[PDB]
Design a protein around this ligand. Structure first.
Ligand code: MG
Ligand code: MG
Ligand code: MG
Ligand code: MG
Lengths: 422, 422, 424, 423
């Protein structure tokens, strides 16, 4: 039925998934020609496989293709794409922003394309060398942040399509007001009605069906911390509304936050998504268990996702042994996609700060230490020390030789210093 | 004469500089209105001040805004923009390329714009906090790679203008064939005639004059390693042509490479640039001395630039003492701008490979080690641990409060996990 | 006080203008260095002078730089930048969209920059030829559509800065919900509270102040046709809410649309903008006079803007004589800025349909007809038949000669077919 | 062999085509995963069909998605993508440029993507309306300008690939030096060696092969007017080099231009391309015939392309009857793809100059005239008078209703002024 509209969709893919629209709606709305989105198909099927096969799938937020590549090289099986990081250092306004849906709605998909393209080059490099891949596949699935959909259902519809074209495997949408969107761990968050978010999720699903891809949808609730709500029109929200307190000057309703609205919303969103995610204030396994248990009484076996946030101070909140076991324990509760949202930002910024500081103090000695550390990391699989090969110089050499039937006088690698000193 | 066309130019800025065009040419070709390029002016003049006053100015190649920001935070006084790194991970084709001028000609200027924008936000943040700046200025000059001009004099003209609008302080142009451009440390480089490169330096100078900015121009020569030359039409190149080899299948001449043609070309380029740069195969102080000495006999006091390249295996070529004193010794020779081209690429890629590998093997324990390392760096100047502040959340909060006369219910910081846990 | 923060502002620029923020807020929020935005300065001041001195300043919607260039060549003194047209054929998602704020927020300012760049080349070409300009200035002020600000006040603030950087002279904001934004002339518009739109207007002003430019702000109301409102929280909107009908399933309030809420909203917005604009359902001079009279009772001498929409059927509504005097009459009521929003889209799409149709039918005969019509327009100031000159070939030839000391072997124009076959 | 690497390539697609590289080279260089390029397949297979079945395929240069949409609605069967037009008003440096490869190399492919996306929306609109399409197909093949390939063979390889991703059906490359590229109808053109252009052509083909698409390659020569050559290294160019004149100051060789070198270069390029094209100074049937006949002596049946350039003054060159038959005559010679390169630019700029001028003189009367003409064109098939439908407002309404099960309050069309005033 829907399975014939999404040919790559595996058996069971849409078990327990409801749609507001019909199969006929999809045919009517997808135009007259078949256009393939291969990287979206592959990515979404591979993610589906991974989350059902592994203990759990864990990821880090990448802010560049290069970061994604090294993640995959090191053996990670998925890539997370943070909207927070897109705002900070990788968006289409070429500015640094806080995490408030300030940048243009195309930014996220543009980064997802960047990441897939770098992985494609990684793949082309190793395929040309003819000794097989150094990894399972270069095309690890990307799970990406669509924030609040950048407005209404149609904005959700459009960003979902954009992500699919860019080759993302999964996409997450949160029940905040786009016009006042915040980082989950900032104050002042404003919820939209349960129904209004079900519409965005359904828009995402319609986009996927219309593109013909089995793209995963992750529903996120920001209700643990959020104390404001745009409208009480939905009876499911009304019980958490503090009527005595009245409306704010902006017209917002005031609500009781915490695990209870997260449970209610999560259960109401369950049929319209593939994974559910509750933002939390602290890395708390007991809270995580409590949420997992309540969701699973209503929807046994529902797959969950968890944000291992750098907005948390880890060693303050937890002891060393709990830190060690954290993701493993979450995995056994059903949290099959886990991610450190802002890893890329922290790694990039600390690393460069520490190098620039050392460079100021001792100039070239500071750089030699990095280089030597790079050299020592090769036993463990690091290859970027040979930077020419890494970025594809040898691949493009072989492209040249094939074009000229071998007779190019201007090949790069033979007389390089990389060949002579590495 | 030119000083009135470039009002921001300081006294003696153009001492010993020659132009092919006249001041009247500039008035004819600059349009009828005055358009200011504030960051290009400030950057050019600051870089001019720095390179004369300081023993040497050293830099690192930044591939993103955030990297640039941390460099300036750490105390570095200038920023290098690497074409190699643009090709690798930061271009407008959204692909990973080797260093062969494959990406679209606008990519460098776009990254320059990103860097200045990130710096601008950083300056906005601290200005709004109202306790003064933590640096001398956030607007550290950017010295940017225009590669081989992306074609002819008109292409050189255009990329220079683009860099000026993006707010670059200095721009380098090399004497390679754009259609076969390579990294300076790879094989198969093809030089263009001495005359042809002077045409591009002059295109670039006219660009700055027409824009009304005292932008610095750095002429680079790749003759140390290049064994090919497109044409022997310039008598200055003929003495290095191996007429016994014959031409190559592409019609290129074969030349004898080494320091002799770098000196010749450098001396010939000196009147049409502000600094001169010879690419080297090894980090060799005696070679740098010999080059500096030769250049200075013809042109006393000429300012030089040097690439401290990651394409060298530093510990294999030099002992610890020579590495430690390397830049200082170059400085005393007149190499007043020195830069590690690929630092951003090696920090980003090393750092993430290592993080991703620890994360694979030990999950949150690996990430907590980074975070703890971040906190520990706070004593030395590090700030990105408080990531919400770093990217401008506090700044935009203050914007919101000015907009709403102080009444907004949806500000980010007060009830953030940042404010509670950091 | 604010005049020292905005050095280019002429005397009286901010007369009658209220601000939520202080001059200290501006100094605190603008960074430690001075950055200049030359085209924005020039555009804003020239637009300010034109709207005070001319009977009325009229414009057409440009969807490309070339379109804008011909408008200025033809003698128009301002340019309109339509969001509808951005959605249709000129946005940063490379897609055709209906007019519902579906494209990325940077699209408008990117088209503004394109337009100013074309005008810049046009000016360089003529400056380089040395015979003076064929127009008053190539840098006609651009007035540009910021739609609903693409979200809240901070989104409004950002699009304003983007437009200032791109060289926009004026920017308009409308009291619709960004997330459900529509063309003024479509159904299903949802208004935001009067207060919330005043927030967006002030964000815009703070933006201009912080950038240090006297950019014009045009406040638009969509209350003539809008039957929905996000919230009744603002007492000023409660007199128009139909409480009998209830809220929609989405929780929107239903309101009584028309001239009255437009008048009220407009009067509330007045102190926070430089021009006020009420979208209308028909080209109706009587309604336009009523609106002008009411606003002027509250705020004498307030400048207004009128949309001469192609979404109207003009001959169906009006006779030839009313159509002929329409903009003149509006000018006297105080409508000092008047624009045909979708002019670019209709001329582009009509023109090519008809050319393609003739081409299918009779191949080169259809094109030759266009070419002769171009020759025929030259007497009236048209220059684009000589296309090589128009796009700057001659300008860059002169650049190359300055570089090469007059010696290059590869100049383009002397041996071109333009020089050989397009002599008088 | 190559047919298994390019699954959608029809029988005989590569008859008579030579390659410097091998099937195995392709396998080695294309990576380990099959990525599909649907619109480029459909486009290339469609262009191939049309050029073998129609008397000739004629096209106009579109500088925007909207322009291309009206072209296809009007009944034209292909779209030309001009680099000249990209330079003028549609490039990724957001500037007006002359036609000299000064814009960034991604600009043409970006425009190709825009065109395909508009056409896709047009198709979506009609498919949702349910009455069938009003055109044979909305996805008319795009033939796109790759100019001088923006550098060496690797640059050609990359631009070819970008065009395939954008959905182009065919791409053209010219034997000029990219660093001093010009419009064919300007002076100061510098050619590259015959061999050097053949490598660009093969680079393009290797890209198509590696992408697994049967994209058409069109080889252009600028030898008719070009009097300069980078190098005389290729013995095929040497008979046309004026050695007595010597090299120019830049080191260029000087050559006898004209139809003879075009014929020789065309004959050499022929195995490395699907169509050949000679730029001309005048629209001259005799010169066209001489070119076609000489190329066909060496390569019977070779398809040709002809630029019907606005850089010509048409009525100054030709009488009304020769203008009238021009394209049909060329068709009979084997010129199966013909195109008015700068059609989009002239239409856009003429039309708006005249609109603006009328508007200055008499304000709304001028615009009302446009609107009436639009209404009058509806009988002939014009629809953009209803601009809201045209850009897909109706389609997105239908999207909302599917999202909300028919229950949106905020749909656009029912109460629009389009519905009320254009009935
Ligand atoms: Mg996020
Ligand atoms: Mg470089
Ligand atoms: Mg609009
Ligand atoms: Mg062309």
């Amino acid at each position: 039925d829907f399975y014939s509209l999404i040919p790559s969709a595996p058996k069971g893919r849409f078990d327990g998934i409801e749609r507001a629209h019909t199969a006929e709606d999809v045919k009517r709305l997808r135009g007259s020609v078949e256009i393939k989105y291969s990287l979206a198909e592959m990515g979404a099927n591979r993610l589906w496989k991974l989350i059902h096969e592994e203990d759990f799938v864990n990821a880090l937020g990448a802010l560049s293709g290069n970061q994604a590549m090294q993640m995959v090289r090191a053996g990670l099986k998925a890539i997370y794409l943070s909207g927070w990081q897109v705002a900070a250092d990788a968006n289409t306004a070429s500015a640094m922003y806080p995490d408030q849906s300030l940048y243009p709605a195309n930014a996220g998909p543009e980064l997802a394309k960047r990441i897939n393209r770098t992985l494609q080059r990684a793949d082309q490099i190793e395929t040309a060398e003819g000794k097989g891949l150094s990894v399972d596949t270069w095309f690890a699935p990307i799970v990406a942040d669509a924030e609040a959909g950048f407005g209404g259902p149609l904005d959700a519809f459009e960003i979902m399509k954009a992500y699919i074209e860019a080759g993302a495997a999964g996409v997450h949408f949160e029940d905040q007001l786009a016009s006042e969107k915040k980082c989950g761990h900032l104050g002042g968050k404003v919820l939209i009605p349960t129904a209004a978010h079900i519409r965005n999720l359904n828009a995402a699903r319609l986009a996927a069906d219309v593109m013909g891809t089995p793209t995963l949808i992750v529903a996120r609730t920001d209700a643990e911390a959020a104390k404001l709500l745009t409208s009480d029109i939905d009876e499911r929200d009304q019980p958490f509304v503090d009527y005595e307190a009245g409306r704010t000057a902006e017209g917002f309703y005031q609500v009781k936050n915490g695990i209870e609205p997260c449970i209610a919303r999560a259960i109401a969103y369950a049929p319209y998504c593939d994974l559910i995610w509750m933002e939390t204030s602290k890395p708390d396994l007991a809270q995580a268990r409590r949420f997992a248990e309540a969701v699973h009484k209503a929807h046994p076996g529902k797959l969950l996702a968890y944000n291992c946030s750098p907005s948390f101070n880890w060693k303050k909140n937890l002891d060393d042994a709990t830190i060690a076991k954290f993701q493993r324990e979450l995995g056994a509760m059903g949290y099959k996609f886990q991610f450190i949202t802002l890893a890329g930002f922290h790694q990039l910024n600390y690393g460069m700060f520490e190098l620039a500081r050392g460079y100021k103090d001792r100039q070239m000695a500071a750089y030699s230490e990095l280089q030597q550390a790079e050299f020592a990391a090769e036993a463990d699989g690091y290859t970027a020390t040979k930077h020419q090969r890494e970025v594809g110089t040898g691949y493009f050499d072989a492209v040249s030789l094939a074009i000229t039937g071998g007779q190019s006088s201007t090949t790069a690698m033979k007389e390089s210093t990389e060949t002579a000193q590495f």
